[PDB]
Every structure is written in C-alpha cells, then in structure tokens.
Amino acid sequence: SSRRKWNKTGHAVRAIGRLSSLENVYIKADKQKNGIKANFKIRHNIEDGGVQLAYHYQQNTPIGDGPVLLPDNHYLSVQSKLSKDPNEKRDHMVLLEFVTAAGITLSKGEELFTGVVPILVELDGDVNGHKFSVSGEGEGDATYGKLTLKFICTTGKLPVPWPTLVTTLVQCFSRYPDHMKQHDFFKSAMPEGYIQERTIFFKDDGNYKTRAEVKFEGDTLVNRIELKGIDFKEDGNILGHKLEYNLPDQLTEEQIAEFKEAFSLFDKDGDGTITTKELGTVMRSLGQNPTEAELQDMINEVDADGDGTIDFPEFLTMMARKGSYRDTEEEIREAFGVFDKDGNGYISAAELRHVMTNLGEKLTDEEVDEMIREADIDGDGQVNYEEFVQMMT
Ligand SMILES: [Ca+2]
Ligand SMILES: [Ca+2]
Ligand SMILES: [Ca+2]
C-alpha cells in the first residue's frame, strides 16, 4: 500500500528522468563528406550493481561516387538481446536485434533490402596489446529492422566483454518508416557501401577506435572492421570482465502493473496517451518549469508513431528499457533531489508531504509518516540516499 505509493511516485520520477536523457542513436547529415555523423550513449550493466557508460562518436562516408541521401536530423532506436548457444564450446555471442528509425514527426539501394539478406562480419582487434578476432554470420530483414547473428571469437578467449563489441559488430538493416524513407543514407549508399568510423569512450577507462567497411560482396552484406583499444585499466570493468552479459525478459505482471500506475499519473484524463500539457502538469507539480519546446523534445525522444504524444504502449516500451539498463549515480541523486528539496541529504516527512500534496495524491499526515516508516531503515525518522536506493529497486 505505502510501497505502491513509493513505487508509483518513484516510477513517475524516473520516467521524467528518462524523457530528459538522450538514449537514442542520433544521426545528422555531413555535407562535407556526403555522409552522416552519429553520436550516442551506451549503458553496460556492471555485474555487482552499477553501470559502465560508453560514449560513441561516429562518421560514415560513401565508398562509391553515386548520389546518396543526406538525412534530416533523426534517430535510431535499438533493442538487443544477447544469448548463448547451448551446443557451442567456443567463446561466442548469439545476438538478436530490432532497429527502427524515428524522431521526425508526421532510393535505388533500398531495393536490395526488401527481403532477407545474408550477413557476414569480420573483426580484427587489439586492446592494450591483447589481440583477438571475431567472425559472425547470420541474416538481416530490413522490413522489420531485424538482425540475427552468431559471433565466434576465432582466436580463443575474447579479452574484452562481448557487450562492448555489439555496436561495432550494419545500420542499413534499420527500418525506416514510410514518412522517413528519404532519410536513409545507409541503404542509399549500397551496394558499393560505406566506411564507418567510430571512437568509443568508456568512462573512467580506455577507448576504442574502429574503422569498418560495410558493403555488398555478391548477395551478402559484409562488415569488415579493425578495432584498436588503448588506455584500458587491466583490472577495470572491460579487461577485468566485470560487465553483465544479458538482461532478463522479466516484466513480472506486477512490474507492468506498476508502470501502468505511473502512466495513469500522467494520463490524467485517461485517454491512454500523454500530451505535452499532461507531462508539463506533472513536471510543474514536481517543481520543474519546462517550456513547450522542451516538452515536445522529451516526447519526441520516445514518440514511436510520431503523433506528438506518448501513448500507453510507447510508455511501456520506454519503461521496459529504463528497467533493463541501470541509472548512473548522478541520475539516482537527481531523482533523490526531487524529494530532498533542501539538499540536506535527507528526505523529511514535510518534504514527502510537499511532493505527495503537489502531485495530487491526497493522503493524511499519518499516511505520509507511514511511508517514511516503510522506507526508514536506521530509524532516524527520515529517508537518506542509501535507503532511497534500497526503496527504488
Ligand atoms: Ca491523456
Ligand atoms: Ca506517439
Ligand atoms: Ca531534506
């Protein structure tokens, strides 16, 4: 009962947190090279709690002379599942991906991706002097933005965690909606292909420099990559293999139920969609003052159909992703600061009362005190950072 209030409010706060962040693959045109630039952020869960961030900068240039499509600013959204082959002795990765383009509200090479295309991947790498090779094969179905691939480390033991290689290991398989067909540089550069260059900064650790050639060889789409890693800590999350491999399908029906409870705090008229006005209302009642522009930006970050609203499914998707990948300490501390309005490091009854009252949740002072009780571990009559965290898991 009180836990439900903590989780509902918590989920609402973390939802605004997510809508404030930039979690997609952001693509912009680069006229100087008739290609595109991209930038994005990857969250890698750390085995025993915590998250390792990987910041990506990306550049793509066509290989051929033929005309290509230069996109308006937009993004790709990616869902990955990593798994193992039960009958594989070798160090390997089974990878399933769904990639979809969005971010804009409501070519010849494209023809090559109408059906299922075979894929081959070859990677030679060197990180802090630890050399390795990866070879992968599978297929892509751009109609659904689907990729399915199996990768083998052909030199024995992979000296870095599989998850860190994923973004390096064919964005031409992304699904562009009809109203965005003209923004698909990747397919447009086919069959001759493109060079794709990245630098990937692992926070508080080393970096990768990758150069890859993505093109058709016969009927097969082939990605050939070289990767150099430097400045890695030998006992860090990467070289020390401290990153989790997979996340669960989870979503205990109770979790979805909680997501829905959070959703209905935003959807105050119960039409199954959240507007800029609704998102705004909640944000203000939490003590923020975003402008209409910002509201539109936040919605566009998750607005799959481009209708300018967050509908219930889009919200569920957003929350499922937010539940998969852990938040940084700073993010949790900001969430905390939403309650800890004086910044003293402690959530007092008066503060929790201010929040719940402004939120519209009408309860008695005794109910507030009960919430504090449910949260209070050490018994000081307040909620501190650590208690907050242990509450929001
Ligand atoms: Ca609504
Ligand atoms: Ca929508
Ligand atoms: Ca306080």
Ligand SMILES: [Ca+2]
């Ligand atoms: Ca306490």
